[model samples]
Structures are given as structure tokens and as C-alpha cells.
Target chain A: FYKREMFDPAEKYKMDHRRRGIALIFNHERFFWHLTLPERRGTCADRDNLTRRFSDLGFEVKCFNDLKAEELLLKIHEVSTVSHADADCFVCVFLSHGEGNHIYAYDAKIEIQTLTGLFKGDKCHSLVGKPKIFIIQAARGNQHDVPVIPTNITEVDAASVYTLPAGADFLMCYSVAEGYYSHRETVNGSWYIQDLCEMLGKYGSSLEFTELLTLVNRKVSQRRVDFCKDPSAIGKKQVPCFASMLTKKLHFFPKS
Target chain B: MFDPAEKYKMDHRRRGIALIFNHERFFWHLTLPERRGTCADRDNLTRRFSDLGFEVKCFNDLKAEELLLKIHEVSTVSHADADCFVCVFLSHGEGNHIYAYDAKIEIQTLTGLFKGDKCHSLVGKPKIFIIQAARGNQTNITEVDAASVYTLPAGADFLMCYSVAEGYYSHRETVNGSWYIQDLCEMLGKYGSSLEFTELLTLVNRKVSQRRVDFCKDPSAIGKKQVPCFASMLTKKLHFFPK
Candidate 1:
């Protein structure tokens, strides 16, 4: 049932890291009134869950809440430019509401690139070859609760140049595919974050990063939720997306 | 396994159209390297789309104006009969324009031709544009137009994929073709009939990023890497070749 030729078996890839790097979690629960976005509930659980999980996995965890787009950039610039000489990798998590290709802070929309670009190989020379992981939990689009009725008609949702240089070793994992809703339980947490934490907690010590993410994808894709918190919001399935440019296998801990 | 090919057949019998624009040589002013192994990229893409049930049209080495004209011509043709549209651009580029030999035209200027207003036949249909080019200095094209109310003008039913990140270089081996396109085609061939397009692209991105790319002979071009970027305005699931 699996495509053996396309992927290496999980057992064959192992990683041992001596440096416990830094992991930053940005938990944006509120928004400016002018933006007209709903407040996210139960995100505290995701925040607490990830904070604890990353810490347990040997990271110096930093948590921030309700930053504006500028503030987000400023913070990323500050951290990405610093030396990662003592760390094995870098991890950043974004828990917020989003649209296609862009995530919102309290006041404005920030292109995911604007945030990740700071850590590009040339830009962040200090972390040039190390793995940089970004875990994003946000709605890809606002399509989860459209009524079959006619009234609500609307739905929402690179590089390169002539020789532009990119840094090596970055992986971006999104909660849902582009232009699809990502569900978060008002009381429990987002399906993606919860499932991801569970998978990592259970398999982080043995499985490769891609293998663990594959399991996360299977779990997330199988679960349905009412993202809009309405009964009409049925069959909202999320399949986590992973875009990895890591040159080598990434495992969180020593093979134990 | 979920077979997308069969699902597509059951859902709709109409196959899609795929357009490939392969721009290898640029004008003297540009001084861009000829995309040496792009023919393999082109051939691979054509075969993959054909296998996936798309009627493919490939144009090679078009000038900027010609490229724009061709796009408009294709857009004008009624695509109501088709399920989706796939456009692949293989070329050199800057922030604003995709190089067409001597011309560098705005990327949107070409994509804008297929907007709902101009191409009524494709208004609600998926338009997938995969651009395989290096990065430039201009900001990536994004919009939140007044007409859509916090959304892009090409705001719905569109998916744009870039070969690399902004201001980044993508790699190509003379023998194997560009890393991004090759990996993308390979991933799609293996998974397109079973997975959604975005899901397929995610795997492609991962596979491409997993490999290291270097130019041993060209000292200036040594030690480069690439990661594809996927942007979506698509509102529904897209399975290229149904099971």
C-alpha cells in the first residue's frame, strides 16, 4: 500500500542531536476590531501543548502572543539573524487564523515568505546549513461553513530570479492544504496541533521527521470538524501539508 | 487507496487542458544561462499531463508579446467544456516579469487574461499555473482587491506554484533537467491520480528540498538549493488524473 520507491523506510534514517536549540511559538488568539476576524478559542491548549512538547524534546522555548505584522517581522529578524552556533536546528510555530499564502497577526496580514525569508541562507548566514522548521496552524481558506442556501455566496481564499540565492534546509508544515479550512476545537484544540503533538510525542524519538509528519497527515486527513462551529459546517477535513527542503533526515532526538 | 482517476471519471468525463510555455533562450541584455536540460523537463511534463488525461499544448521560445498574445488567445477560447486549466511556464524571470526571450512582461498581466471577467468560460474552473524560474528582486505578486473584499482578484479557483522562493536560485543538471520540475512531475506521476494537487505539490516540495544541488564547474553558481512554493486561490479539491 505504500510507495516504497519514493520514500526511505523510517527505520533506515536516524538522527542524533547534541544541541537543544530554540523553538518559538506565536499564539495569536485575538485580532483588531477593524480586521473583523473572530477570536480563536482553545488555542491556549495548543500553545501550552507545543511549549511543553518542544521543551521536553530539548528546546529553549519562547512564547509570544498577539503580535502585529511588523512586530512579527521584527521578532523574526531579531532571532533569525542571531547565531545558531550552539543549536542543532530552529523551530517556529504559528497558531493563528489565515487566508491563502498569508497569515494574520492582530492588525495585519503577513506573507508567510516575509517571515521565512529572514532565515534564508544568505540572509541568516549563521544558520545557513541547519534545519529550520516552521509549523503553521491556521485556516487556509474561510470555506468551512458555507450554507447551501443562496445568501452567503462568497468564499475566500517564489522566488527566483535570475540567479537569486536560497538558503538550505527549511521545512514548512501547514495545518491544511491551500484554500481549505483548518478546524480547531473550541474547547480541545486544533486537529492539526493536537495530532501533531501526539505523533511527535509518541514517535519523535525513533521516526524521521517526514515519517512522523506522514502519520500526522493521515490522522488529520481522516478527522472532520465544524471549523465555523456550526452544524452546517460538515465534512471539513484537513490534510496537513509539508514542504521540506531539508538536505538530510531530521529526527528530534537520539535513536533511543 | 483513493483513486483520483476513477473519481474524476465518475464526477466528470471532461478532461482538462495543459499549456506549457518553454522559454529557454533569452535576449542578450538578460544574459541568462540557457536552460540546457529543459527539453527533458518539457517532454516529461507533456507525458505526465497526457497520461493524466490533459490535452496538452506546448509552445517553445516565445517572445514576451507572443507569450501574452498566446495566453489571451487560449483564454478567449471557451473552456466551459473542460474541467480545469493547467499552465506551466519554463523560463527566466525577475520579480515582475517572466522573461520571454527579449521581453519581460508582468506575470499578472498574463494571468490576468484568464480572470473571471475576461474568461467567462473558466470563471469558476481551476486555473493552475506552475512557474519554474529563478527568483528576482521585485516583490512577489499578491493582491487584496476591493472587488473581492480581502481577497485576490484572481481570488478563487487558482493555484500558482513557483519553483523557488523569492530571491532564490533553482538548480538544473545538464542531464536531469531542473530539479523542481523534474521532482514535481515525478511526484505527480506517482501520486496525482490518488492525491489532491496541493498534497502532491507538498510531496514534490519535500522531495526536491531533500536533495542537495551544486554546480561544481560554475564557481559562482556552486552550492545552491531550491524549494517550491505553492499558492492557492482554489476553493475545491483538484485531482489531476482520476483513478
Candidate 2:
């Protein structure tokens, strides 16, 4: 179904915590040589852009670069355990190489659910009933026919565990559709994140979250990404995907 | 959890609410013809939601200000116990406004009253608005984003489903009611519990798309069409009946 997430205008709702919240950005720039993962050359720009943008929106931005899978989990657990009694919302941005079901750290792959599930209402009591927004910029499949994109191994409590409790207030924006390749500029950054930051910069204060994202989708859908019109992967397009369970309007109003 | 029947039973226990604003007549100054089949549309929607275990309420022929007041009043009450909320409008409308008997109110003004800061109890729940009205003539003359004419409060769980596209007329026979509502209810009855709300809406869209709404009596309007538009900000999958 091609349903765009809807949202109200900014004038109607103000952020509950105007200048207090946390935004964590995991910018993975390097992979082990044996892993043969291409370095994300332009991702620092994305990190700097989002960090500044979120700071303007009243979030205290935290950037962690090139963490291993276990380190990523530990970081999530530590953050989820913190008291969020005074904050309005939480945002996590992950930039890394990926395959379906998992994203890479410097040396290993981590299940996407393991990272997200830390903030589950029952699991993260401190942040229960708060909004959790995740921006994931990664390929959903091995589009370049690369052998190093990590694969999932059988594990307990994995992504397939459909019996998780109902109604957690979270929103995930994926860079591309399932089983598709997402485009990135060696210099400009991933298509989805760049567009998101640009659109949010343009509409963040006026349009609601979904409305801003809708504009991002529109802009991304218009340009056919070919990485400078490469012969091997020319004319292919990418559409971002959203899975949201948020129950309230989220507005980030700067101090006036 | 995947079984529709189980989900239906589970959600029914949560006590959802559905409201219908049926504006069948306009004040004399408004000069708009009375909507004859509006009651049928109201009846069909009321029945459908009621069957899905919603506590349904209907407001009839209020003035524009009164409609806004009514929405704000409803927002004050706690709907924390409910699974979701649904609002349907059957009236005459312009670009961003729906008519009460005498005046027009912006759709955003109505839905905005339920923003999280204003209506905390219903903050994250899906607030659905289904508008079955003729587009205001002004839309054709003015530049407007018809799909986004109604601005909901930011980050809220909202869905706006209109019966027809911008600058278009909706069809209703005196007896059968509006084409959109009839098909909406029909498809919902067929798949409401069996599929997700979006899926059910897709089915309704498909069925509505196939109909040729020929206004045989009015030559200029004959062979016209109405395609429903859905704007959803729902964070989770919803099944009205679930089974």
C-alpha cells in the first residue's frame, strides 16, 4: 500500500519539551579490511548536518562513529536505561552498510530488531510512552552483488519474533524499499538522509513530521539516481519506507 | 496476533469511538442545495462502525462555529480507554472548509483541536476523517494542494480519506446515497475484519474506480468520475472489525 504518513501543521502542536531531548547518530565510516566494506566517504557531512539540525530543534545531539555490533547494543542499552522523565522524544540515526534484516558495525552485523527493541515499552521503562524515531540509511539487499554484506544467522528473539507486545510508539524511516538498493553520493551522502535533512531544514518549523517527510519522498522520487550516471546502475530510483507506531503529534519548536 | 478474528475480539474490548457530522442542509444565505442522500450515508457509516464495536455519535446540521465548538468539547473528554477515533463528514465543502448549516470551517481547525497538547487522552491513537462532499468551487480558481487541504496537527496519528479528488463532484442518487460511502461500507463489510484498514480502503478505492458516475439528467456532468483520496498518518496497522 502506498500510504504516506499524515501529520498536522506545526501551529497546532508544540513540542512538549522545547529544548530537551536526545538524538543519537551512529555514523559508521569504516569496516575491517577483511570485511571489504566500502568506506562511507560523505557520511560525515550527513552526521554534521543532522547534528546541527537536531540541535536547532532542541535535541541534545550525540554522535558515535564506527561502533562494533556489541558496542552498538551496549550504547542502546545504556541510553534506554537513562531516565527520560524530562524529555519529550528520542531519535536514533544509523548510517552503515546493510543487508536485509541487519546492519553492519565495524566488524560484525547486528539484527535491526535488537537495536529497536531496547526502546520497547516493556523493555525500556524509562522511555515508556515516549515517541521514538529512527532514521535508517542502509541498503536493504546486496544490490552491488557484493559478498561482504552481512547475512543473518539463527538466533533467539530475532526479527521473526512476531509475538512482541502491541502498541509501542515508534517510527522508523527506511532509506529504501525492501529488497532494493539505496543510492548514495560519494561526496553528497545517502540520497534519503540528504533529502531528509534538506526537507526538514526547509519545512521543519512549519510542517509536521510526516508532512516534512512527505516532501522528502516527493523530492527523492523525482530524481533518478545513477551515481553520476554510471553505466552499470543507471536510471534506477529509490522510494523511502516508513513504519510508524506513534500515537501523538511531534513538533520541535525552537525557543522564540 | 495475525488472525483477524482474534485481533477483532481483542480490539473490541478497548472501546473505540466514531463520530458522524451530517450536514444535510445549508442556511438560506449559503444558497447550497440540501443534500438529500446524506442521511443514507450517515446511516451506513454509523451502522458499519457500530458493528465494529465503536460507540457511535452523530451531530446533525450544526452551524460552522458550532461544529468547531463541538469538536473542541469532545476533545476535552477522555478517550484514553479507546483503541482509536473516527470522524466522518457528510456536507458541502470548499478547498479546506466543510460546511455547517450556515458557515464553513477549516478542516484543520476541527482536527487540530485533538492535537496531543490539546487532547492528550487521544494523542497517539488514529484519528480518521472521511469527507464525502463536493469540492468547493474556489479550489478550481485557486492554487491548492487538494490532497493536503486539511492540515492535521503535527506528528499525530491521523488519516483523511476524501470521497473525490480536488475540484470534483461526488455522486449520490436520492435513494442509494453517495457512490463513495455505499462502496466504502460495502467493501468494509466484505473485508473490514479480514484485512488491514488500509487494505480495506484500497479495495473500496478499486471498487469506486470501476463505477461510471454518469449524471444522465445533467449533460455537462455525465460520465464523470470520483476517486477517493486517502492521507494516512497512522503509526500502526488498524483493522476496524479485525475479523
Candidate 3:
């Protein structure tokens, strides 16, 4: 009887909402002058590209640029506080400089925990069983990674590499491994994002989300660059990885 | 590149092997207390996996080198005809290593032997490793004294299901076995063939998280909670339905 009457993947998470919640993009281009962090020149293209891609996937996309640390916190807190009982899922992306356990605002650094902690099952009961996706594109400094095609390579910040994630129902996708450098093509945007966007465009609606992410990992890892003035980093790699605590299969089955 | 939409082939000659390494008694000099219910865990797991069509094998109290050799031997053999693989470690562990009676060995070393390059036959198949070990020696809150604390190798197609999160206590009853193994076995028996493997694991996660060290002689142990977590790098759907 049990084998005959099984729960399909459809019964895993409620995905029939009228709206596919918000896709919030924190695109940081220029940092505060006093901080000595380089301006993220190609970040604008990355933001625009993602905004369009996420929107195509039915996310009501919102873009914020160069938010100071406090502003970034406030905006996310406000979003977290909003009742998401009716939305299908939540998506958040970060494009900026980052370090261990942190991402930089226009002025200061913010712990990744402070942001992700708000949406755990206990804190935000409305999103308790829903998917909370975080796509972070940044790298840290021995940092060991940088842009592949740009004339002069500059390494962005690294996403905080958590020993363990804040809570479950999270699918945290980092542009590169926790300790490695993330590559960007000043004109083409980040290697991770470009491949990620391409895969989403081609497979987003039809493919399982985690499986789709593996394609991004393969695509990003397969990229090899031999022409670089910095001979040391010429052959370096950027491999994307994700840590999933999601209990069930996740697919972004398109909705009208 | 592997196709993203395909489910892992579960129609091989069999449901494959399930290896349970049960470590109850530790080396006397090691100072690690006896894991009283680990044998019960082994028995429960062996029976459940067998019911799910696996050829279950249980090993008890092997030294570090012996344990390594046994697993290494298993990895080298061709799993070409098997559906997938399952390994369970029931022992004291800290950090990225698990105890093998006399010594501790890195978990990465054990899991790495089965990576696609090293173990070609098992490549692209589900290589599930279930760890029921603790990380730190942290005590139960400022509340109790009897509880103990303790502590992956990560890769594709691999699912590391930890009995408890890092630096947390993993409760086991001397008579009933571990809280996680008990819940996990029950789930496997009930939903192993019905739900996707990770989905079933999630149910186990929810089940184990809902339990507490309730009704313990140690007051501190009472009300202490354990939340099981699994890190999945699997690229496709994994279902353990009987062939």
C-alpha cells in the first residue's frame, strides 16, 4: 500500500503560490573612498544581467546598489520581516567584496550570518518550509583567484565560508570555493554568474535546481585561462560549490 | 558532462552493499568512553538496509589500520554491476576524523578513495556515507555533566548525513541504540523505497531534531536536543526503490 501510494516530489514543498517571491540583488560597484577597496567596475553588468534573468524566472526582482553596511542590513531585515506566507520561494544574490564570514558594504563588513539568520524556520515561520536560495559571487585575498579576461585583474571579496550554515531549507551557492579566488571578466561579468545565468536560461524551467547548479559548477571549473600577465595566477581555477540543507528536491518549475 | 535531468541508475544487478562499522569499545588508553548503544545501531541498520535490498555487512571494533584496509579493499573492487553504495560509521569522532578503536583517521581519506578517478566503477553513482559521531567534547549546556560532545570529506554524488551538528552531543541509549540511528532505521523501513533518498534523509532530520535527551537519569541530559544534518553534493535524483 505504501509503495503504491507514495509522495511525489511535488508534495515536498509548496510551489503553487501565485507569485515566486522576491529576488533581491545587492550589487556593490563603488566602495567608500576611505576603505581602500577597489571599485567593482564590471559589477553593473553583472547586476543588470541577473536582474533580467531572475525576472524571467518569475521573481519580482529588486536591485540595490552600493548600500552602506547598515543600509544593507536594514533593507534585508525589512524584507525578512514581511510575511512571505503566499510566496513560492525566496532568492537573494550578493555581488561584492567579501571575507571569511562576511561581505563588504560600501563602508564596512557584514557577517553573512546576520543576513541569513533572519530567515531560519524559527525566525521567519512564514518561510519555514520554503526554499531560501543565496547565490554569492565573491572571492577573498592568497586569495588565489581573479578575473580571467580583464587587462588588469582585481580580486573581489570572498563570501563568508561558514563551518555550518545558519539553518536548514537553505541552498547556499558560492561563486567559488570558500578559500579560493573568484574570477570575473571585466566586460563579461563574473565567470560564475555568466555560466550560472546561461544554465538558468537554458535549464532553469525544465531542470531540477540542484542538478542545474552542478552544471554551473562544471562550466565554471572547466574554464582554463593561460594568458595572464601575472604568471602565478594564469593557470589558477574558479570552481563553484553549493552547500544544500534542502530536505527535498528543488525545481523552479515556471509559473505564469 | 553528466546530464542534469537523469536519475541515478537504480536498476543495476542489485541495490548494492551497505557497510556498517560499529565501534563500541574503544582503546583503554584513548580515554574515550564506551559507545554503549552502537551495536544496537549496527543491528538496526543492518536489518533495515537488508530489507531495502542491500547486502548488509557489519564490522566491529577494528583498529585504525585494519578499518582503513578493509574499506580500501572494498573500494578497489568493481561496483560496476551494483546500484550504489552505503557506508555507516558508528564511533567516536572529532573534527574531520572518526575513531577506529586504536586511532583516529581523517574522514576525507576514507571518502576520497571512492572519488570518480579513484573508484571508476562507482563513478556517477550515489556514494552515501552516514556518520553517527560527535565532534567536540563540549558539555551539555552549563546545565548537565553526563553528556559528551565530539565531531566530512565532501564531493559529488556523495551524501554525508551527520547524526548531529558539529560540537554537539549525540544521545544514545544503552539499550535502544542512538536517537539518530533509531529514527533513521525507522524511516528507511517506512519510506526508503517511497521517497527520494535525500527526501527520506530530510524526514530523518526532522524526526531526530524533534527528539530530546528526555527521561535521562542525568538531569542535564534531559531536554538536550539533537539535530541531524546531511550535506548533499549529489547531482541527480537518488531513489532506493527495490529492483
Candidate 4:
């Protein structure tokens, strides 16, 4: 029942560019054995879900799977260098394992800041004063985080990527709070991604973007991992969160 | 409309504490020059927050240890009756580390103190951090006026405000304060009670971005720009409507 506010040119972000912008998805399922990281089983479902959802919203969705840290950074930096002068906004999603401030590539890890810093106003002038959205699905803090519960812990995933800079015209959404467990159903997808896709499908064209994210937050937080072998994690909860620095409301109103 | 205020349950008895760490001069061993106009920034924030239902506490020129100690002291206290929390840092910094009088401290460590596990009473409450720091070297820099993360496990309810985005220079005056802080205080005074906090922050972003180093003597530095930004994890619309 929510409705868009009256159109004040300055109040809402310009969302009717010829192109809805490029949505780059860097999906990593397997990591090097030396890293001692777990395999991400349901990330494919999450990646495919976002590709379809963002495609439906008029983005040119592209996916890259299993690239090493430097290669991944090179690809992202390439996109950041390309002129987004005609595109409405930019979106990048990471599906991997992370520690705290760093997210994993196939062989190595990279700083979240190093990756995001490439798009600052000084660097990416083409995207000046436009939305630069990064969606991270990773884990954080492996220190003393190894709690025993081996039966089926892979069912739920936790994101390790942390440290989003408070930069102008950027939005960083995390799969889970820094210290919380992220839930993913092996056969289905991550709780955050699944819910996010469902919401984007239902309201991506009609709802204000951040307000729609609020729905995802609600859906994620309400999720309880009650059916689990580990009693400690049985009743655990998770909530997806976003950090936004956009100057105006964002509405993906239909391009028609 | 999803009434987020009602969803957030912003019905606490008090608005909570606002901590301001105002660092001006550094210890001589560090060879860091004194930050001019930060005290004015400190005073402005103190006055601004005190009127907005916060128990405003200002700390001046503290060492790294004392800064941590004071914040630890506050984070450990009971915030059961408070609706939210605010912390402000005014100093020099690099990357994720802000400078104290003697040394640099990880922003993560300071922010970690208020997360859910460490500070249970403030869990689920909005924790807002405002930072005013010069993140880079002084090469060709100008002073205009006198001006983490750890995923917060406290659910998505924290907002971080930075004077300048990473890799950019923040402007200040030897006299008035920072361009960011001055604009922020003005915006908070004007629209804080009635406007959505994020939108209010957006206005601050606009205000700060629109300003340039008008009177700088450096030919290249004159007309330099700064864009203040806020990273918000709040799942609900936050309004500082009078308690």
C-alpha cells in the first residue's frame, strides 16, 4: 500500500537513463584449500536469482565466477573506469567467503575498501553524483568463531565482508550483521538473497529502492533457523542491512 | 505505508548519550601539527546535540588509551532507557585508523564496543558515529574554516557519517569549523526534528558538496570540493522528533 512521493526533481534520483546501468555479479563458490574456507553451495542459486531479478529491472546483468582476487579487482576496476555517463546507476554483487574487511576471491582475499575506493568521485568521474551499489554476501571474523556443529552447518551461510566507507552516492548491503550467522538453504538459496530477489520481483518497479530493502530486512530478521542439529544455532536469527549515501530517493519506475 | 518508527519502537524514555571526542593537539613525538578549528566544531556539536535530547559529553585532546577507556566506560553502561546512541570523533586519520594525541586507534575497535554482544542494553538501537578527520597527507591541502566496520551485530541499525569520502580531502577553516560539521549542524538544527534523518543527511551532503575553498591562496587548492557522506544500516526511517 506504499506510494511514491510527489516528484520533486531533486528529491528523487534520475532513474530513466537509456540504460538502467550494468549489474556485475562476481560469484565465488570454491576457494583454495590453503585458505581453509568452506565451499559455498547455494551461491549459484543466489547469483542466478539476482541476475534474473536485476535483468527484469532493466539492468545488463553479467556474472563472473571463480576469479582470483587480483583478477576480480581488475575486472571491477575496468567497469569503474568505463563511462557510466549514460547509465542510470551501477550495481555489483559479491557472493563469496570473507573475513572482516576483506572478501575472498578463488585464490586470495582483497580489501573491501580497496575494491570500493575505485569508484570514489575523484576516480570514477563518469559516475559522479550517481548511485554506486555493492551487494556483499560473505562472512566475517574467523577468530574464535569456530564453534562445533559439523552435521549440516553449510545450510546456513555467513558473509565475511565488512567495512563500507561512508561515501557519496553509494550503497553497501550486507547479508548478515558482522557477528551473526547467515542462513542459506543448500537447495534453495541464501535467506537474504532469496528474500531480496522475491521482494525485488514484487516491487522493484513500484517501490522506492531503500524502502524495498527495508522489506528484505524485515523478511530476513524474521527468519529463524529452528530446524537444525546444533542446539546453539537452532533459534538463531539474521537480518540483511544496507548502508546508503545517495542524496535523493531512488525509484526504479518503469522505463516505458 | 510501513510506519518504520512504530516498527523500530522508538519509544525509549530518553534519546541516549552523545559522545564527542575532540582532538586538537597531538603529542610532540608523533610530529602531528595541531588541528585548528576543531574545538569550534566540538562546541557546535555539543550545543546541537544537547538540544536534541542527548546527554552530551565532550572529551578534549585525549590519548589513544583514554579515548578507548572513556568510550568503553560509556558502552558498558546501561542504555535500557535510551532510544539511540551517538559518537563523534574529531582528529587526524588514515584508512580505518583515527589518530589520538599519541597514536592511532582502529575505528573498528571503538565501534566494536557498542555492538550487540559487547553492549547488550543498546542492542537493536541506532548507533550513529560522526567522524571528522583528515584521512591523507598535507600535500597541497587547505583548511577552509575551522572544522568501521565490523558489521554491527546489533541488527541493521547504525549510521556512520564521514566528513569526506575515503581518498578525498576534507576542508576546514582556521577559524569557523569544518565545512562538513558546520553544514551538518545547520541542517540538523533546521530539519532534524521533522525530516527523515537520512534525507537530512542527504541535504548535508548537498551543502558540503556545494561549498568550495573560496579564499585559499593555493591556486590549485582554491575551489577544491568535499562531499560529506553517511553510511546507514537502519532498517527503519529515523526521525529525531522531540521526545
Candidate with maximal lDDT: 4
lDDT of 1 by residue, A56-156 (tens): 88888999999988888888889988877767788989888776557789889887777778887677775766778888887632334333332111111
Q: Over the stretch A93-146, how does candidate 3's per-residue lDDT look in tens digits?
A: 989877766888888988887888899766888898788999887655322333
Docking class of 3: acceptable
Report the Cα lDDT for residue A173, model 3: 80
**What would the per-residue lDDT of candidate 2 be over residues B35-89, giving only the tens digit for each residue?**
7777888999888888777789899998777777777778888887787778888
Tens digits of per-residue lDDT for model 4 on A1-256? 7657532324777777789999999999877766766677788999999999999999999899999888898899899898898899999898887887788899898888888889887799988878888998887423332333332343654555554544668878888865457877776888899989998998888877877777788778777765545566664667667766677888888786
In model 2, the runs with Cα more than 4 Å from the true position are A1-256, B1-12, B136-154, B213-217, B241-243
Higher-scoring candidate on TM-score, 1 or 3: 3
Cα distance off (Å), candidate 1, residue A71: 4.9
Q: Best by DockQ, which number?
A: 4
Candidate 1 Cα errors over 4 Å, as ranges: A1-17, A68-74, A140-167, A226-229, B1-37, B42-162, B171-243
Sort by lDDT, top down from the best: 4, 3, 1, 2
Per-residue CA lDDT of model 4 for B6-92, tens digit only, reads: 346567899899999999888888877778788889999998898889999999989888888999999999999998999999988
What would the DockQ be for model 4? 0.30
What is residue B113's positional error in candidate 1, in angstroms?
20
Model 3 misses residue B189 by how many Å?
2.8
All candidates: TM-score: 0.57, 0.48, 0.78, 0.81
Index of the highest-TM-score prediction: 4
For every model in order, what is the number of clashing pairs? 21, 12, 12, 17
Candidate 3 C-alpha lDDT tens digits along B178-228: 888999998888888877776687777666665656686676566666666
Task: Report the poorest 10 consecutive residues by lDDT, candidate 4 chain A.
Answer: A143-152
